[PDB]
PDB file of all heavy atoms in Angstrom:
ATOM      1  N   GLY A 119     -58.846  37.425 -55.980  1.00  6.21           N
ATOM      2  CA  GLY A 119     -58.531  37.068 -54.610  1.00  6.21           C
ATOM      3  C   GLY A 119     -59.719  36.527 -53.851  1.00  6.21           C
ATOM      4  O   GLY A 119     -59.664  35.437 -53.281  1.00  6.21           O
ATOM      5  N   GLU A 120     -60.799  37.298 -53.846  1.00  4.00           N
ATOM      6  CA  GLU A 120     -62.077  36.862 -53.302  1.00  4.00           C
ATOM      7  C   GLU A 120     -62.543  35.515 -53.846  1.00  4.00           C
ATOM      8  O   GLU A 120     -63.029  34.659 -53.108  1.00  4.00           O
ATOM      9  CB  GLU A 120     -63.145  37.905 -53.610  1.00  4.00           C
ATOM     10  CG  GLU A 120     -64.559  37.376 -53.482  1.00  4.00           C
ATOM     11  CD  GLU A 120     -65.522  38.066 -54.448  1.00  4.00           C
ATOM     12  OE1 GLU A 120     -65.047  38.853 -55.305  1.00  4.00           O
ATOM     13  OE2 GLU A 120     -66.742  37.782 -54.387  1.00  4.00           O
ATOM     14  N   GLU A 121     -62.399  35.338 -55.148  1.00  4.54           N
ATOM     15  CA  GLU A 121     -62.830  34.093 -55.783  1.00  4.54           C
ATOM     16  C   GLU A 121     -61.943  32.915 -55.364  1.00  4.54           C
ATOM     17  O   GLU A 121     -62.432  31.815 -55.076  1.00  4.54           O
ATOM     18  CB  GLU A 121     -62.821  34.279 -57.299  1.00  4.54           C
ATOM     19  CG  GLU A 121     -63.484  33.210 -58.090  1.00  4.54           C
ATOM     20  CD  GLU A 121     -63.334  33.451 -59.576  1.00  4.54           C
ATOM     21  OE1 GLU A 121     -62.783  34.522 -59.951  1.00  4.54           O
ATOM     22  OE2 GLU A 121     -63.756  32.568 -60.361  1.00  4.54           O
ATOM     23  N   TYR A 122     -60.635  33.143 -55.331  1.00  2.00           N
ATOM     24  CA  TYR A 122     -59.711  32.127 -54.852  1.00  2.00           C
ATOM     25  C   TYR A 122     -59.940  31.776 -53.376  1.00  2.00           C
ATOM     26  O   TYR A 122     -60.012  30.608 -53.018  1.00  2.00           O
ATOM     27  CB  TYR A 122     -58.258  32.574 -55.054  1.00  2.00           C
ATOM     28  CG  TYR A 122     -57.276  31.509 -54.603  1.00  2.00           C
ATOM     29  CD1 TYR A 122     -56.877  30.508 -55.474  1.00  2.00           C
ATOM     30  CD2 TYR A 122     -56.769  31.493 -53.311  1.00  2.00           C
ATOM     31  CE1 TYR A 122     -55.997  29.519 -55.073  1.00  2.00           C
ATOM     32  CE2 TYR A 122     -55.882  30.519 -52.902  1.00  2.00           C
ATOM     33  CZ  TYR A 122     -55.499  29.532 -53.794  1.00  2.00           C
ATOM     34  OH  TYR A 122     -54.622  28.550 -53.402  1.00  2.00           O
ATOM     35  N   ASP A 123     -60.048  32.776 -52.511  1.00  2.00           N
ATOM     36  CA  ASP A 123     -60.192  32.487 -51.096  1.00  2.00           C
ATOM     37  C   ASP A 123     -61.525  31.821 -50.775  1.00  2.00           C
ATOM     38  O   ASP A 123     -61.568  30.968 -49.911  1.00  2.00           O
ATOM     39  CB  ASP A 123     -60.026  33.746 -50.250  1.00  2.00           C
ATOM     40  CG  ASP A 123     -58.691  34.407 -50.458  1.00  2.00           C
ATOM     41  OD1 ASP A 123     -57.728  33.712 -50.859  1.00  2.00           O
ATOM     42  OD2 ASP A 123     -58.597  35.628 -50.214  1.00  2.00           O
ATOM     43  N   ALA A 124     -62.604  32.210 -51.449  1.00  5.78           N
ATOM     44  CA  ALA A 124     -63.906  31.565 -51.228  1.00  5.78           C
ATOM     45  C   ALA A 124     -63.837  30.078 -51.618  1.00  5.78           C
ATOM     46  O   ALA A 124     -64.234  29.203 -50.857  1.00  5.78           O
ATOM     47  CB  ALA A 124     -65.009  32.270 -52.025  1.00  5.78           C
ATOM     48  N   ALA A 125     -63.326  29.819 -52.814  1.00  3.66           N
ATOM     49  CA  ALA A 125     -63.070  28.446 -53.265  1.00  3.66           C
ATOM     50  C   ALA A 125     -62.221  27.661 -52.262  1.00  3.66           C
ATOM     51  O   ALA A 125     -62.657  26.604 -51.766  1.00  3.66           O
ATOM     52  CB  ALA A 125     -62.414  28.463 -54.621  1.00  3.66           C
ATOM     53  N   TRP A 126     -61.023  28.180 -51.958  1.00  4.12           N
ATOM     54  CA  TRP A 126     -60.110  27.544 -50.998  1.00  4.12           C
ATOM     55  C   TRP A 126     -60.817  27.038 -49.740  1.00  4.12           C
ATOM     56  O   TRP A 126     -60.522  25.951 -49.247  1.00  4.12           O
ATOM     57  CB  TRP A 126     -58.983  28.511 -50.590  1.00  4.12           C
ATOM     58  CG  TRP A 126     -57.992  27.869 -49.646  1.00  4.12           C
ATOM     59  CD1 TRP A 126     -58.053  27.857 -48.281  1.00  4.12           C
ATOM     60  CD2 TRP A 126     -56.809  27.143 -49.994  1.00  4.12           C
ATOM     61  NE1 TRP A 126     -56.989  27.160 -47.763  1.00  4.12           N
ATOM     62  CE2 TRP A 126     -56.197  26.714 -48.808  1.00  4.12           C
ATOM     63  CE3 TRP A 126     -56.193  26.805 -51.210  1.00  4.12           C
ATOM     64  CZ2 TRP A 126     -55.021  25.981 -48.780  1.00  4.12           C
ATOM     65  CZ3 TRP A 126     -55.023  26.074 -51.184  1.00  4.12           C
ATOM     66  CH2 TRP A 126     -54.451  25.672 -49.983  1.00  4.12           C
TER      67      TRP A 126
END
Side-chain angles (χ1 to χ4, degrees):
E120 162 211 7
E121 192 184 355
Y122 182 87
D123 302 335
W126 182 270

